[PDB]
């Protein structure tokens, strides 16, 4: 076989240890999910906008009492109601409260006021993978692999809790002071025991079954991992066009082309992740995540060492101080206006 019978026994013991870990992690998650830390806006100084989206923005804030810096996501309640996003915003808060994993951003506070919802999370000063990747062009395969391994372990954790993530992309992956990945933006994360039906995500990263309005499962995250690995190693994603409709047509087609510098091991992995046929997609078969973890492209990956953060990272962001924003791009700064009248109170009773 590929492994001697001893190496095979080591791998087996390793896989049983994973099951033991995930069983404990489920017990801890459920304790928090059933029986869940507020603050208020004037407890923080607002420093700088770190990112912007349809419903609001993320701001660097400084907690007045402690001097700690955080990233505060601000959502305009009226804009959230205007869409099927009420449920999604409640999903994000509830999931972030309850999960615990080294590569998942930690939520510190949440609160709401007349106009907005607020989630205050750990500030990750190394910046988005997105801007490092766009600056350097593409990551070498070892560098991409180090990040990919952290996503594989994070999805193994989330999926074991019946959580789908649904928005993997470099924009949502921050680099910490040790060069490891922090996954952010749980706005589309959801507890799903079997299938779900919402058309949501980011065009370049959507699995075909989402685009085709089919009920879908956690395998959409494994497709998205294929897109991410391709983009990290190529510098651009596999289904690449100026308009969403053109992107969707490429995704459904069942065709991918690879740069000539991709190793054959990488291409083989990607053909099995970017697999339209769900009966053949890695991560969706009888052996589950182990088809990915045991793939040749990951043969050098020490999964436990990655989890334990023992591996030297390929890139350490420059860090000048705890509130330094030099690794983030600039955004237009807008006033944070709070209405004197409560908006959408009944819709957000549970937040």
């Amino acid at each position: 076989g590929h492994m001697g019978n001893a190496a095979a026994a080591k791998k087996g013991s390793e896989q049983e240890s994973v099951k033991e870990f995930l069983a404990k992690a489920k017990e801890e998650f459920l304790k928090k999910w059933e029986s869940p830390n507020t603050a208020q806006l004037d407890h923080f100084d607002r420093i700088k906008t770190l990112g912007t989206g349809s419903f609001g923005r993320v701001m660097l804030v400084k907690h007045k009492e402690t001097g700690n810096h955080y990233a505060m996501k601000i959502l305009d309640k009226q804009k959230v109601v205007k869409l099927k996003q009420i449920e999604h915003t409640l999903n994000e808060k509830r999931i972030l409260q309850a999960v615990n994993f080294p590569f998942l951003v930690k939520l510190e506070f949440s609160f709401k006021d007349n106009s907005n919802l607020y989630m205050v999370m750990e500030y990750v000063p190394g910046g988005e993978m997105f801007s490092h990747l766009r600056r350097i062009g593409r990551f070498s395969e070892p560098h991409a692999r180090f990040y990919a391994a952290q996503i594989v372990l994070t999805f193994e954790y989330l999926h074991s809790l019946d959580l789908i993530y649904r928005d993997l992309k470099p924009e949502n992956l921050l680099i910490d002071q040790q060069g490891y990945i922090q996954v952010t933006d749980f706005g589309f994360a959801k507890r799903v025991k079997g299938r779900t039906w919402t058309l949501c995500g980011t065009p370049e990263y959507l699995a075909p079954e989402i685009i085709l309005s089919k009920g879908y499962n956690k395998a959409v995250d494994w497709w998205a991992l294929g897109v991410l690995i391709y983009e990290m190693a190529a510098g651009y994603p596999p289904f690449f066009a100026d308009q969403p409709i053109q992107i969707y047509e490429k995704i459904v087609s069942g065709k991918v082309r690879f740069p000539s510098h991709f190793s054959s091991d990488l291409k083989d992995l990607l053909r099995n992740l970017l697999q339209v046929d769900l009966t053949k997609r890695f991560g969706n078969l009888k052996n589950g995540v182990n088809d990915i973890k045991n793939h040749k492209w990951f043969a050098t990956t020490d999964w436990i060492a990655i989890y334990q953060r023992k591996v030297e990272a390929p890139f350490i962001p420059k860090f000048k101080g705890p509130g330094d924003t030099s690794n983030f791009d600039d955004y237009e700064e807008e006033e944070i206006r709070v209405s004197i009248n409560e908006k959408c109170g009944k819709e957000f009773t549970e937040f």
């Binding site: 349809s54 997105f130 058309l199 949501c200 995500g201 651009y236 100026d242």
Partner: peptide
């Protein structure tokens, strides 16, 4: 030719 800037999520197709 494709999108090189930050990509926004979609809530409906």
């Amino acid at each position: 030719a494709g999108r090189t800037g930050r990509r926004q999520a979609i809530h409906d197709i």
